[PDB]
Design a protein around this ligand. Structure first.
Ligand SMILES: COc1ccc(-c2cc(Cl)c(Cl)c(Cl)c2)cc1Cl
Ligand code: NA
Length: 231
């Protein structure tokens, strides 16, 4: 069954210099295969921590990731203006990949992925999303689509290995097809028979293999392309 990730706090209110702790609970054991993402106010998503406690490139040791079993946390000390953002945890232990609903921090008082092809369609319509990749050896990396719903949740849609193996979340199976062109360095999502609940911003992400056989982090995110499905 699906692993539910729970972030009990939807927002925490803090002052500059404060220390804040964001909880993340898994509904079952995830073997410490927990990633944390930061989404800035402008929508940009970056990887923050992977494998519970390993800091991603560029992240200062003011951030500490902790936890085991089902109980995890992210602590940010010496809170800075640049930390005002929404933080999401994500388990990478079993499919479907699942995210917590996010915890916003509020104050009191190179590699490129570019998505295109979104649009507005009626239920039952079709769209082809594209993600142009540059700045890395595209054919060696797993790639994914992750959508952000109007309620601001992150939902994994599909992933494809460098060699073309594919994986989908159940609710899109048989309705979308992920594919890639390793000569043109483009990732695709063909969407058919669209449904209203598919309305979301679709982000393409690069997967970094953390531990075999298939524990990944999403180490780079595009800004997304919007899909709207309306009667
Ligand atoms: C059987 O379990 C799995 C199979 C595949 C993937 C998976 C996750 C990501 Cl993010 C990428 Cl990019 C890829 Cl290519 C595969 C993950 C799991 Cl847990
Ligand atoms: Na507030």
């Amino acid at each position: 069954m699906d692993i539910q990730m729970t972030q009990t706090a939807s927002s925490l209110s803090a002052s500059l210099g404060d220390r804040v702790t964001i909880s993340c609970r898994a509904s079952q054991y995830i073997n410490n295969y927990l990633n944390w993402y930061q989404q800035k106010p402008d929508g940009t998503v970056t990887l923050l921590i992977y494998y519970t406690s390993i800091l991603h490139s560029g992240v200062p040791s003011r951030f500490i990731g902790s936890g085991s079993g089902t109980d995890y946390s992210l602590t940010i000390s010496n809170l800075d203006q640049e930390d005002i953002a929404t933080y999401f945890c994500q388990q990478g232990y079993t499919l479907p990949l699942t995210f917590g609903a996010g915890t916003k921090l509020e104050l009191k008082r190179e590699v490129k992925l570019v998505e295109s092809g979104g649009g507005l369609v009626k239920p039952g319509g079709s769209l082809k999303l594209s993600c142009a990749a540059s700045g890395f050896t595209f054919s060696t990396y797993g790639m994914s689509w992750v959508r952000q719903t109007p309620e601001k949740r992150l939902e994994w849609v599909a992933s494809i290995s460098g060699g073309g193996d594919t994986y989908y979340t159940d609710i899109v199976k048989g309705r979308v097809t992920i594919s890639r062109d390793n000569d043109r360095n483009i990732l695709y999502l063909q969407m058919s028979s669209l449904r209203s609940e598919d309305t979301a911003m679709y982000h393409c992400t690069r997967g970094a293999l953390v531990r075999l056989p298939h524990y990944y982090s999403m180490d780079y995110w595009g800004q997304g392309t919007s899909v709207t499905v309306s009667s």
